[PDB]
A paper describes a structure:
In the Gram-positive pathogenic bacterium Clostridium perfringens the conjugative tetracycline resistance plasmid pCW3 is representative of a large class of closely related toxin and antibiotic resistance plasmids. In this study, we have identified TcpK, a protein encoded by a gene upstream of the oriT site and tcpM, as being a major factor required for the efficient conjugation of the pCW3 plasmid. Our data revealed that TcpK was a distantly related member of the wHTH family of DNA binding proteins. Our data suggest that its function is to decorate the origin of transfer of pCW3 and to interact specifically with sequences that are only present in this region of the plasmid.
Superposition of TcpK to its DNA-bound form does not reveal any significant structural changes to the protein (Global r.m.s.d. of 0.40–0.9 Å). However, the DNA molecules have undergone a subtle, but noticeable, twisting induced by TcpK binding. Unexpectedly, each TcpK dimer bridges across two strands of DNA. This result is in contrast to any other known wHTH protein, where the dimer arrangement permits interaction through the canonical helix with palindromic sequences on the same DNA strand. Comparison of the TcpK/DNA complex with these wHTH/DNA assemblies reveals that TcpK interacts with DNA through a novel binding mode. Here the β-wing (β3–β4) sits within the major groove while the canonical helix (H3) only makes a single DNA contact through R60 to the phosphate backbone. Additional residues making contact with the DNA are all located outside the canonical helix. Additionally, the protein makes hydrogen bond interactions with the inter TcpK box bases (-CAG-).
Numbering used by the authors:
A (entry chain A), B (entry chain B), D (entry chain C): 2 to 101
C (entry chain D): 2 to 100
Write the structure that this text describes.
Amino acid sequence: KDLNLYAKELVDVVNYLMKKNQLVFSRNNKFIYVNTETIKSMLEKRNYDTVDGKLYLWRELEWIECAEDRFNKRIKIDGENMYAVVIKYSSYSILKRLYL
Amino acid sequence: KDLNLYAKELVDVVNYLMKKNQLVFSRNNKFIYVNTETIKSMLEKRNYDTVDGKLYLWRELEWIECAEDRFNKRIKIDGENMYAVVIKYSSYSILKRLYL
Amino acid sequence: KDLNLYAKELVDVVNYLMKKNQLVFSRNNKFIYVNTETIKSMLEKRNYDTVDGKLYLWRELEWIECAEDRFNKRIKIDGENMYAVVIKYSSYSILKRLY
Amino acid sequence: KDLNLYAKELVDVVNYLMKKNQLVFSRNNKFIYVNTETIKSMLEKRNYDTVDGKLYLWRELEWIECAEDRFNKRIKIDGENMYAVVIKYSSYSILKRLYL
DNA sequence: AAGGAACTTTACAGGGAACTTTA
DNA sequence: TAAAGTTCCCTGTAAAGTTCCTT
DNA sequence: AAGGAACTTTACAGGGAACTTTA
DNA sequence: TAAAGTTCCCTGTAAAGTTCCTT
């Protein structure tokens, strides 16, 4: 039920990977690319909901950009294609402001 | 500090105006048009944040459709132009569901 | 002699079981699974029509998805097969929005 | 609001055109084809809602079969194509049984 | 008719290859 | 003017969704 | 912010021709 | 089959939806 749990996690995940210089930005800096496995591992810790439950809510509330039927989208870094979990910077920025 | 207060207010504002029959809908029924002065009066009551503070978070989380650096939007009803605060019905339904 | 009695009952039944957490959703969240016995017990209360009379109208107006000669369809929850009364979320939504 | 007004109209319209022999059936007899103009003229009479308001509700509740972004669909009678308002016979049949 | 068993689809996971868009 | 961003093709998988088949 | 004016889109309306499905 | 049923091409329109631009 409690929405802060999901919002706090999104901010915490981005803050953690930002410190551990483990996050990449889109060309326009409007999006954050995170590895699907890293994010799914970090979401396993807090047992308020399942990893898929957290990603469904993030997708539905449009805090992450997904492809049809998936929790991630195709990206290109240094001419190589891969899948990444794409977090909207705009969604991270207020949620962070709210808890700052 | 509590994201639920903002989400509960959005649902409560829509529920209040729905009972008092004061809602206008978009052609596709995907959006709710509310008078700017009305929402700004209703948002004055609960003192967890300022009216502008509440509208900034609603805009940033994309629960309302606005024009760049405004909380308002231009609409058209019976050939006449006016400004309304435009609430996404999808955002209202997702949030009402998440609390009941 | 009133379609609203059937319509309002569908919304009321879904609202009741949603609060009491006795509702399960399909994978795509397009359908609501309800136990055949629970729904048949709840439909006994309001005497405007019989339980089978209410389920016939719900089926015919396609507010519920049914198998051939029944008012329930086969479902699967955690690899186990069973029969449930399957309510279209679409129907529930539109009807809820009417009132 | 009063759903009976919409249901009673659907049954009344089909009953009227059935007597005046202005009804055509699908091959499987599961659908009723009515001329778009005739039905829109008949829906003008009872002022509880607009013609477009009545057809939106009929479409939503799936009492009529429509094409994407329309209140009618393409049909074929004796090798000739035309557009008709297609009423589900199943929808007409309970709505009629309820009110007899 | 009722339900155990078995077949089909889906919603998540992935990639090669080539196209379109942007700084 | 080249790399990001996207789009069109596919594959893999476990459980949901559905149908077969027996009683 | 407010509002005149003018642009673009959408959800309704139509049809010829050709494709897919059914008796 | 051969006609029903459907889809793929297109066009037209008025008002909603949006943007431009000035105050």
